[PDB]
Amino acid sequence: SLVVFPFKHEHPEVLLHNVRVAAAHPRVHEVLCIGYERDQTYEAVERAAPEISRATGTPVSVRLQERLGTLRPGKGDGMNTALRYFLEETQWERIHFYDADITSFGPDWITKAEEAADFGYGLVRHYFPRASTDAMITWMITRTGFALLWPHTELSWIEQPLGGELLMRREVAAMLYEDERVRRRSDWGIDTLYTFVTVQQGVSIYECYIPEGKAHRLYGGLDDLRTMLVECFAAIQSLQHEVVGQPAIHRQEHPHRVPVHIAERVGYDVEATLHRLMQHWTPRQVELLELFTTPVREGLRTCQRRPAFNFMDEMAWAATYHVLLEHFQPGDPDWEELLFKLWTTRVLNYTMTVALRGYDYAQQYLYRMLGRYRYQAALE
Amino acid sequence: SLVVFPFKHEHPEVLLHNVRVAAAHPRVHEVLCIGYERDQTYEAVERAAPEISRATGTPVSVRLQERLGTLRPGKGDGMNTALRYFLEETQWERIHFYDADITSFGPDWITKAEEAADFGYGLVRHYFPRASTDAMITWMITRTGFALLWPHTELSWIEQPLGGELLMRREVAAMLYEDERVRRRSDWGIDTLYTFVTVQQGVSIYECYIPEGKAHRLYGGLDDLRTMLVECFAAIQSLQHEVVGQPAIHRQEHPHRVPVHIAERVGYDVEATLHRLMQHWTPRQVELLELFTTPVREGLRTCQRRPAFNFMDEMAWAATYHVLLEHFQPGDPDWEELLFKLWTTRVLNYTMTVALRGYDYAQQYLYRMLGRYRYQAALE
Amino acid sequence: SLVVFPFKHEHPEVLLHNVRVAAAHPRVHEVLCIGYERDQTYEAVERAAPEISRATGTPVSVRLQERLGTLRPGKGDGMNTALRYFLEETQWERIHFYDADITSFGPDWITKAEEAADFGYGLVRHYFPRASTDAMITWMITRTGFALLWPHTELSWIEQPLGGELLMRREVAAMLYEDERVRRRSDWGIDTLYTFVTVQQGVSIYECYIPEGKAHRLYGGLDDLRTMLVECFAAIQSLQHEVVGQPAIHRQEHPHRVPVHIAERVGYDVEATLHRLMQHWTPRQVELLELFTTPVREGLRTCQRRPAFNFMDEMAWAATYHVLLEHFQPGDPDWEELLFKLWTTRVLNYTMTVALRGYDYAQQYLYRMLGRYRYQAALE
Amino acid sequence: SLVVFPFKHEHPEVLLHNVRVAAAHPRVHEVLCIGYERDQTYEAVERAAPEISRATGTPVSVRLQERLGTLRPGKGDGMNTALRYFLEETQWERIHFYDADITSFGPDWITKAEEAADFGYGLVRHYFPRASTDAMITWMITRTGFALLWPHTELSWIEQPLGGELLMRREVAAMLYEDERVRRRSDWGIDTLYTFVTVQQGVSIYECYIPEGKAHRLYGGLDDLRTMLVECFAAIQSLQHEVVGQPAIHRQEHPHRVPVHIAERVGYDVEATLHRLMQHWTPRQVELLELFTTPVREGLRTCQRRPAFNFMDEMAWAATYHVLLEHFQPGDPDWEELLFKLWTTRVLNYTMTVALRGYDYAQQYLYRMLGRYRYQAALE
């Protein structure tokens, strides 16, 4: 199999440790590291790769990501480059992707994916326990959008649709690489597109549970996720008129109990997030709120003077989501800022009405939330 | 729709309450209670039925169980009698079954099933949170058997294949009533047959979760479940040469959090179960053990003198299961007793090595046990 | 014994139920309700009292609160009035107090205290499970103050020093009624004074745990507690130069498991609390902040423009507490408002850095917080 | 301070790692290892000590335990030898003890004990979370006996009275070494005696919480703890007519959440324990059961033919405890065997009626159990 580590500026020593683990695994026949640019990380990896190849007997190569899509040059260009190399320059039957900064990587991650593929699955996804205030794009944007738009399908049931740890067999990789919607998604929206079109094409999917290993982003406001937010939402919006059938084979390995350090984690800086909600207003943002329901219009306009978020409950967020789907303009600074502020208020509301009640409450809430959204959408 | 309560002499007040709930529901057009004989409970319903019919506008009938099958006259004859009534004496589009002794029955059970059926699901199955030491036939016999024999099918992914709470569309009921394997299963094996035949015919299935749970049997040893055990195993055995194709449509509501009283419940009397393991031995049972693996043969033979069960781990049970599939004879007293003792040791082993580690450990264990059985079955 | 219900506002039906429970208890020889004025609630009890007295054989009286102290005429005047009645108009050996608005009251509360008193304890305090964002005066003002000022004494080890549910032996009541510091504390400070003076005098204390819990205030911002805060702080301040000796007898029932609804409760409205932090500023409040440490001065001053609270960590709060002890003036509107804002920031900081990590984390944090404060106080 | 590691046959590499940790600690001025005999562990330690002393600048000494007491030469001779060395051959102000096979020892353990002693405590005890089926002597023998015999005292409130991780100041060590009851306890009963006489003498006690580090015994039947059981019971029995006052200063650091590997642990082999209950019967054991209550007499006699334990509920165990206190003869093989079988049935009953309900249920149960035993004893 080919194992791929896309990387940008992640610390090279954790990356190289992970490369070594992959290369030493008996089912891995090649490791590919796809870099963003010729930075310090890149040169460290290029230098180290020959010694790793010699010591394990498994070839390790390093390449620059190619410009294959039409959005911001980002993660999608990286992953689609790897698909191209896999398809046009190798004969391997399976390709894995893992993020470069995973902290708890071991041979078992590779073995679990390969063994599930041996059972017959076309796509294997690794999923992880997350803090109640992490994964707010996943839950409030991606899974919510899938539930509201395609309530009868498997889309909203995929645990971590934005997750970059997965295995594809060759035929699935070939289908994705040939798909123009996937190829153009050069930015953060790539994982959304891989998830969407594998489901739409009826690929069998297995989700392996890994208790630990996603790196935590640095402590910061929700502002730190703003680019990912606007690109992940734009991806959902770009797909909104697609038709998706019900037939799916989609299985999930049952979780173990969540590790204490995940249950006790806080995923963002609340004070910074409240402050940022009051910033970067324009007269145009104030006016565009006329498109939204009255409680949301009045609630977000209040944020010019002080942080407000009690208004952005579960139902208000769904109504807001549909207004954004119709009117949001990708690339337009005011629309991107409005999406960001609106999402902020939902996350804050969820934080104080759900997450503050504790990890177990939050987990049951989130699944029931998707349930109510599917039900509402199916009736309308 | 028709709502059916199969009942026994137990708790007439509980049956009548459940009958009033169904009769008062706006989507229910008829209620039918089926009993074995005209005892005091039967007569209480017959007597109360005209007043319930008048108050709700919903006809309530009571009928005797008919001898339609060829095994022990038990639940199957009752359920198949109700199917006959549904098909030959009404024109309703849907039929519900709920067993009569459920103490948390409410109108939302009916609503949830009816609304799922509105989207075209042919079968709606209600499933419930269960204690870690309940559902030992479900897990160790029914789901295990489905996993070992049909690993690539939907069968072992049905949560509660023995569950008697469900809704069928008329066309599904007609198919089951016309099927000779189903009709003959007059005993406890009926639920297994309904599950198996619906999956085999590719019926679309929705599983709705009922979060408060259902009714607990009286505290007792595992031998309170002995007849059910031997009949549920016999049902699997009778089906073992069947061909079952790939998964059709299966949607499953995500389980809510387990109620504390269910997570903290103990499902059987351990002391009584250990004692009963040393009872009812014969020379023939000792002889029949020659058909089993050495560790199982010596382990069970030890139970003549003292309780032993450490031998009956997951792998030993699977080997034991295949020997029983080949050699077990339903109706033979020694085979029935050997199955009961073998199953008892498996339950005791699971109790001390898994259930004692806590509810969350037990849940992951059971779901992953099925995963291991399927994977092994597909690989050999 | 005498059972006393101080009452207010408070729907009369809750009060009358509690009176009926006390009156029917075999160890209760008299019930006394104390209110501020002859409003409708007062008249309802006076009207019901003769029937309850005839049915139970237990006399029930209602009396007006007397002006016995020199602060705001509040709970202290009520409780001290009851003490006077107990001592001058009865001969009972014991007196209980319970807040009138408790909805979980039962005879076992009375029994537990009476039986502890049979073993010679002078004071029995009932304590309850509390949500992680309740009891913020208890933790951040009262227990913190006791820990910072008297680290080697029992004071900060009393679980609920503000709790109004307790039993006193006659000699303890007499001591408290005769004490001028207690008598003058007519406001919310009374419970602190009863706690402090009993410990200072070496009264033997039993704390009994009531697992069911007690009354939740209406959902609101922290400013619903503003008067109680300023008066509870003033009480600690008034005592700060007192000498307290080493621990006497203190027995404390081990807390049962927290009820889920308490562990999952949110005790205040975060949005409203954030808004209120930006309100009621004066130039004098801004000037008064020159007395505080630079991070606190700059942090609170930021609250004129937007909510800030990350600065108000555990160490900053202790420094702030000592500045308040020296400089805070009870009755000065600006000092009262500054105290309220400072406390608000501590509560918000605690909520986002501790309570949001879950109930168990918050419990360990709070108890260890007191431990750190005592250790630090003893080392300087 | 002096840090002491008593050792017998523990693996020398773990011991020597722990010695190195203590030696490198800035507050530790000497390490003493007291061995049982000149075995392979002793020789490995004696060999390594010089290089440890040189690298840390802290002297490490190894000595053989002396014969100071009159029971089985065991743990007590080791600990009392260390006391003698501390008192007669050093001038250090504090002595720590740590078991040789602790798995997560670090400088923080030493620091926490020293900082609590700095606050003023005479005795500091480290306590740990334990599996629900570990600590069965601690709970069912030691804490239970303390509760039944001295219900008004602090004795039963000490968390693991059998724990060997502690710090004593010099004067506490001197008091214990000079006490004949303590000096004679050469066996497993020593920790019971240290706990008892420190409480009886009014020593102030702090209990530090450590989340992990106790070694787990090898997987086995309760038989593996038989010697410790009979010696720990004999120690309580030897103390039963002692008078203990109420006054005490005893504080506990609040626990963190139990770690998953502890919550999921099973502490004994249930099958082996059931078997062992049926073994080693004599006519005299059968006859001595005449001294016990009828349900216990009949219940245990049943174990000649099959394992019985449903009879040994909480109340039966208390009644059994009192019969043993009056009639148990230390060293008498029949009485020691009866104690072992009776205790076994209590553990089994507790395991199936409490521990099987899960860790959280068990923890709340055990504290409530002691509370009921105190209450019953206080009334009798």
UniProtKB/Swiss-Prot annotation, chains A, B, C, D:
Divalent cations such as magnesium, calcium and to a lesser extent manganese, nickel and cobalt. InterPro entries: MGS_C, MGS_GT, Nucleotide-diphossugar_trans. Changing residue 101 to A: Completely inactive. Disulfide bonds: none annotated. Changing residue 36 to A: Significant increase in catalytic efficiency. The mutation has little effect on the affinity binding value for GDP-Man, however it shows an 4-fold decrease in the affinity binding value for D-glycerate. A divalent metal cation binds at residues 101, 216. One of its GO terms (biological process) is mannosylglycerate biosynthetic process. Optimum pH is between 5.5 and 7. Changing residue 228 to A: Minor influence. Keywords: Calcium, Cobalt, Magnesium, Manganese, Metal-binding, Nickel, Transferase. (R)-glycerate binds at residues 130, 135-138. Inhibited by GDP. GDP-alpha-D-mannose binds at residues 6-10, 34, 65, 75, 99-100, 162, 191, 217, 219. It catalyses: (R)-glycerate + GDP-alpha-D-mannose = (2R)-2-O-(alpha-D-mannosyl)-glycerate + GDP + H(+). Optimum temperature is between 85 and 90 degrees Celsius. It is stable at high temperatures, however at 90 degrees Celsius the stability of the enzyme is only moderate and 50% of the activity is lost after 30 minutes incubation. At 65 degrees Celsius, the specific enzymatic activity is 5-fold lower than the maximum value. The keyword Transferase applies. Involved in the biosynthesis of the stress protectant 2-O-alpha-D-mannosyl glycerate (MG) which is produced in response to growth at supraoptimal temperature and salinity, and protects several enzymes against inactivation by temperature, freeze-drying and osmotic stress. Catalyzes the condensation of alpha-GDP-D-mannose (GDP-Man) with D-glycerate to produce alpha-mannosyl-D-glycerate. It is specific for GDP-Man, but it can also use alpha-GDP-D-glucose (GDP-Glc), beta-GDP-D-fructose, alpha-UDP-D-mannose and alpha-UDP-D-glucose as sugar donors. Belongs to the glycosyltransferase 78 family. Homotetramer. Dimer of dimers. The biosynthesis of mannosylglycerate in R.marinus can proceed via an other alternative pathway, in which a mannosyl-3-phosphoglycerate synthase catalyzes the conversion of GDP mannose and D-3-phosphoglycerate into a phosphorylated intermediate, which is subsequently converted to mannosylglycerate by the action of a mannosyl-3-phosphoglycerate phosphatase. This is Mannosylglycerate synthase.
